[PDB]
């Protein structure tokens, strides 16, 4: 159970919490703004999934400040996670290449 594998699991676990909180917070921030689309929990959930994967569909995006701040937190958490997996993967391959040359 090496650091990079511990950290990736921690990042993935953390991301799911950021997603769930992110869905919940979006709805609480958006409701009140006229025309806001992120006003239901299941909708905001899949919005979060899209946003965490840096994907935007049409005008399915927050309009409020805090809603957009949530979006920022979701995005950053998303990229950090899928950047940490790559880093963890890279560490695994470089470790084996060190074993490959007997180094």
């Amino acid at each position: 159970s090496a650091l990079h594998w511990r950290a990736a699991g921690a990042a993935t676990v953390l991301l799911v919490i950021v997603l769930l909180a992110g869905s919940y917070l979006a709805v609480l921030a958006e409701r009140g703004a006229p025309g806001a689309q992120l006003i239901t929990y299941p909708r905001a959930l899949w919005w979060s999934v899209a946003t965490a994967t840096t994907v935007g569909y049409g005008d399915l995006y927050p309009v409020t400040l805090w809603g957009r701040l949530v979006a920022v937190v979701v995005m950053v958490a998303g990229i950090t996670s899928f950047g940490l997996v790559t880093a963890a993967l890279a560490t695994w391959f470089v470790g084996r290449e060190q074993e490959r040359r007997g180094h």
């Epitope: 709805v27 609480l28 409701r31 006229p34 025309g35 689309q37 006003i39």
Partner: antibody, heavy 118, light 108 residues
Framework: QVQLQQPGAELVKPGASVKLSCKAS????????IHWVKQRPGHGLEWIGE????????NYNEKIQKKATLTADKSSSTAFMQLSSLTSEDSAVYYC???????????WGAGTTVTVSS | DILLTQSPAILSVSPGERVSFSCRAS??????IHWYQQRTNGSPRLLIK???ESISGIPSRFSGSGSGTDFTLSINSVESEDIANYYC?????????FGSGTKLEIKR
């Protein structure tokens, strides 16, 4: 079982204020939203507001005048609607409804028949 | 604010026939719409959630149709207990809005 409970009727003098109550049993999540709907005699349904009891943030219909102000007591699971400066146009049945935060209002209240007269 | 339009206002039908209430939104709302039944003196009762999905306890005679702007609530074999006002309610954008309503009448 009956989920939401409202007083049957409320009498108010013209210009005076009134607080309306709405307690709830059964499943009461943190994510729950309590709305309030206005129905005049022989008229359609009219959304007035919504409030999440666990945080106390309320939203109001800005199309009509903001006469109401929403508050909620956490321990009693009861939502309140503070209406002030009432005219004859405020004489209506007022419903409270439980919304799981997914659009539809699943369970409704009995309704409070408010009459504005001297 | 989404404007919902229920045409016609009053709807008369023969007993045992099929009926259809239409509700049109001001703009595309997908399937984010809900139907409510309200009889005399009674409080609103949920019939069909999300355009077509049925609620348990609700008769199998009730079924929902439509997407986009055109939406329809339909009853097969209309009976006495169905005489009521019918309301469509959207949940696509804030704030939530209701239709004007459609009253069902049975010609016996």
């Amino acid at each position: 079982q009956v989920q939401l409970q409202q007083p049957g009727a409320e009498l108010v003098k013209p210009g005076a204020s009134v607080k309306l109550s709405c307690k709830a049993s059964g499943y009461t999540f943190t994510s729950d939203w309590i709305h309030w709907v206005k129905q005049r005699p022989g008229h359609g349904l009219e959304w007035i507001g919504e409030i999440i009891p666990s945080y106390g943030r309320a939203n109001y219909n800005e199309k009509i005048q903001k006469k109401a102000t929403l508050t909620a007591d956490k321990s009693s699971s009861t939502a309140f609607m503070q209406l002030s400066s009432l005219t004859s146009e405020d004489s209506a049945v007022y419903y409270c409804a439980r919304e799981r935060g997914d659009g539809y209002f699943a369970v409704w209240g009995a309704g409070t028949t408010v009459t504005v007269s001297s | 604010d989404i404007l919902l339009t229920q045409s016609p206002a009053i709807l008369s039908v023969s007993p045992g026939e099929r009926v259809s209430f239409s509700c049109r939104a001001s703009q595309s709302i997908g399937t984010d719409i809900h139907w409510y039944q309200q009889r005399t003196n009674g409080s609103p009762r949920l019939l069909i959630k999300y355009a077509s999905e049925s609620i348990s306890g609700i008769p199998s005679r009730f079924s929902g149709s439509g997407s986009g702007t055109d939406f329809t609530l339909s009853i097969n074999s209309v009976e006495s207990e169905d005489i009521a006002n019918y309301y469509c309610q959207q949940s696509n954008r804030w704030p939530f809005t209701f239709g004007s309503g459609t009253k069902l009448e049975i010609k016996r």
